[PDB]
Write a protein that holds these residues in place. Structure first.
Motif, PDB file in Angstrom:
ATOM      1  N   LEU A  54       0.845  -1.199   0.000  1.00  0.00           N
ATOM      2  CA  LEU A  54       0.000   0.000   0.000  1.00  0.00           C
ATOM      3  C   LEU A  54       0.870   1.235   0.000  1.00  0.00           C
ATOM      4  O   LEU A  54       0.887   1.960   0.999  1.00  0.00           O
ATOM      5  CB  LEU A  54      -0.878   0.032   1.274  1.00  0.00           C
ATOM      6  N   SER A  80     -10.518   3.551   1.529  1.00  0.00           N
ATOM      7  CA  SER A  80      -9.985   2.314   1.096  1.00  0.00           C
ATOM      8  C   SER A  80      -8.597   1.950   1.742  1.00  0.00           C
ATOM      9  O   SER A  80      -8.336   0.730   2.023  1.00  0.00           O
ATOM     10  CB  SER A  80     -10.123   2.245  -0.423  1.00  0.00           C
ATOM     11  N   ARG A  84      -7.628  -1.479   4.085  1.00  0.00           N
ATOM     12  CA  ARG A  84      -6.511  -2.320   3.780  1.00  0.00           C
ATOM     13  C   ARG A  84      -5.525  -2.368   4.918  1.00  0.00           C
ATOM     14  O   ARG A  84      -4.941  -3.409   5.183  1.00  0.00           O
ATOM     15  CB  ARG A  84      -5.892  -1.892   2.468  1.00  0.00           C
ATOM     16  N   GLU A  87      -6.990  -4.695   7.680  1.00  0.00           N
ATOM     17  CA  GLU A  87      -6.820  -6.108   7.334  1.00  0.00           C
ATOM     18  C   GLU A  87      -5.390  -6.557   7.504  1.00  0.00           C
ATOM     19  O   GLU A  87      -5.188  -7.661   7.964  1.00  0.00           O
ATOM     20  CB  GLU A  87      -7.332  -6.466   5.918  1.00  0.00           C
ATOM     21  N   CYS A  88      -4.394  -5.723   7.168  1.00  0.00           N
ATOM     22  CA  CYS A  88      -3.025  -6.070   7.459  1.00  0.00           C
ATOM     23  C   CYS A  88      -2.809  -6.290   8.961  1.00  0.00           C
ATOM     24  O   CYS A  88      -2.090  -7.239   9.387  1.00  0.00           O
ATOM     25  CB  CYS A  88      -2.026  -5.021   6.961  1.00  0.00           C
TER      26      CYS A  88
END
Length: 121
Positions: A54, A80, A84, A87-88
């Protein structure tokens, strides 16, 4: 952000992110070189790699929201990047919880010159 990551880690493992997971092995905290020393360190490597996916996000400072449904971590909707990043971090916290039985204090404050080797994401 590290504020949310820190809280996930504490909740999952019963350990404070700093210093248990901020100077561990080759990747936990200020990683970036070598072969990971154990399963916990590998969790940090994977986490580093996830952030590395990212490059227009700012995972240390961008805050996200999460809740627990039946004990499980659930990332709330945000931008967004926030999604992300969360979730990491969720994956790392669960990885830490899964490898708690092999957590070894001998890897705390692990010395930089011992981080030898090469490993791509």
């Amino acid at each position: 952000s590290l504020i949310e990551f820190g809280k996930m880690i504490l909740e999952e493992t019963g350990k404070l992110a700093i210093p248990s997971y901020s100077s561990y092995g080759c990747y936990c905290g200020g990683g970036g070189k070598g072969t990971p020393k154990d399963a916990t360190d590998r969790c940090c490597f994977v986490h580093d790699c996830c952030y590395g996916n990212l490059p227009d996000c700012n995972p240390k400072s961008d805050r996200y929201k999460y809740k627990r449904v039946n004990g499980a971590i659930v990332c709330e909707d945000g931008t967004s990047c926030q999604n992300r990043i969360c979730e990491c971090d969720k994956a790392a916290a669960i990885c830490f919880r899964q490898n708690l039985t092999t957590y070894s204090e001998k890897y705390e404050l692990y010395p930089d010159f011992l981080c030898k080797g090469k490993i791509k994401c």
